[PDB]
């Protein structure tokens, strides 16, 4: 509760829905005196963290965070941040976990972890391309993608990798709506037969969907206890990863 | 101030120093170990710094990423540069980069590579450019306040390469030529055998906020490239300035 902590708390009130805040609104949101808020915001301004907007005593974020964000990206890339998340989730669920990222117009699994617990596991290879309609990861990404991107993906004929793969675009749109609503996607043998997957979307600093964090398990191990333990563990790990990359969830995502 | 002191500690991080120990940070800042430790723990609690996985060293925290995204939602300069950089690199066949004023320093924060040649000028984002040794630096000084130019030129100028111009009178002469033509050129002042062209980028208040540049090897600076790079770069620079709601001052030729 020191002066450095107080100043940095003021920055937390800025979000994509509130990019400019006036001195009076900052005073009301923070609970601090106007003079305290003014003094602290002046100190943040001299450091280039905040700046006064031309019209009235309003503040917006400053340009000196840009250099620091570039160094943070260099220090911890998304796949480096995923290593601990994937390791911990694999240990908690006893199943294979993987992070897939949007690489242009496709979704590619780029990092994974195996659990120590079971000898029979869902095996992966990095740079494996996942379908948008046949994987939980793909459905999680599609559900938070632009309507035009979803339209493009569903206009193109949908390949049936397995006899269980969803080929009906109306059925995929129905599933998308359920994932949008609950913030979690499930898929049983749409990419690989006898694999039950759970996935949550990963959002970047700009609130756009980056990819998905998933738990791949054999159908034979999808017990009532696992069906109820995997979703809270995966949701928590997804939010933890989003935090390690400075991501922000869109309003349409339930928390 | 304690806020300003804490944020000065973050300035010691650069692409060559992404991890710093408490002792090295004490050495670099000039503050007592206990002061550095208290300030860094306050930054750590806020997510601005964090302890490096295995080591007992410090690195930058994820909070700066969240704040840069909000800054970019307010002033979409690096997001707008992506398309401009890509197109200019394709047109010139050379590496293009946008550098922005980060307080008192000029940092390269976005770049693009051309697919044309296998050999190119390679970069890293957050690289600090000299005001006297780069075309980008000269473009920014030429449209900076006389007091800022005076400060930069009063401090002795380091020679990064044997070609770096270290005479302040010669730099002032070059600044005047950039102010007159709206474009800066520098041959091997930052990196040997690199010929770069740069134009200033302006904000809504008509103050320079950085520079857009084309970095090429000297061996590829042909008469045709010497003719083609300046019109293409000037156009790309104007395009970027207007996208961020910027305006050129009267002293800038169009």
Automatic annotation (TrEMBL), chain B:
Keywords: Plasmid
Protein name: Transcriptional regulator, IclR family
Organism of this sequence: Ruegeria sp. (strain TM1040) (Silicibacter sp.)
């Amino acid at each position: 509760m020191g002066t450095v902590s107080k100043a940095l708390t003021l920055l937390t009130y800025f979000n994509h829905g509130r990019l400019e805040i006036g001195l009076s609104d900052l005073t009301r949101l923070s609970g601090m005196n106007k003079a305290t808020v003014y003094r602290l915001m002046s100190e943040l301004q001299e450091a280039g963290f905040v700046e006064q907007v031309e019209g009235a005593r309003s503040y917006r974020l400053g340009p000196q965070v840009l250099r620091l964000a570039a160094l943070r990206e260099a220090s911890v890339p998304i796949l480096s941040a995923s290593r601990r998340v994937l390791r911990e989730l694999s240990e908690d669920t006893g199943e294979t976990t993987h992070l897939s990222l949007l690489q242009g117009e496709q979704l590619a699994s780029l990092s994974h972890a195996y659990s120590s617990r079971n000898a029979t596991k869902v095996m992966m290879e990095d740079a494996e391309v996942l379908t948008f309609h046949g994987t939980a990861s793909g459905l999680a990404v599609l559900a938070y993608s632009e309507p035009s991107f979803v339209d493009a993906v569903l206009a193109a004929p949908l390949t049936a990798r397995t006899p269980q793969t969803q080929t009906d675009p109306a059925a995929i749109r129905a599933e998308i709506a359920e994932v949008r609503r609950t913030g979690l996607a499930q898929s049983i043998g749409g990419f690989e037969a006898e694999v039950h997957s759970h996935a949550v979307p990963i959002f970047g600093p700009d609130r756009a969907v980056l990819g998905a964090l998933a738990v791949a398990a054999p159908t034979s191990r999808m017990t009532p206890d696992q069906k109820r333990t995997i979703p809270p563990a995966l949701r928590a790990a997804g939010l933890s990863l989003t935090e390690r990359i400075g991501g922000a969830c869109p309003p349409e995502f339930p928390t």
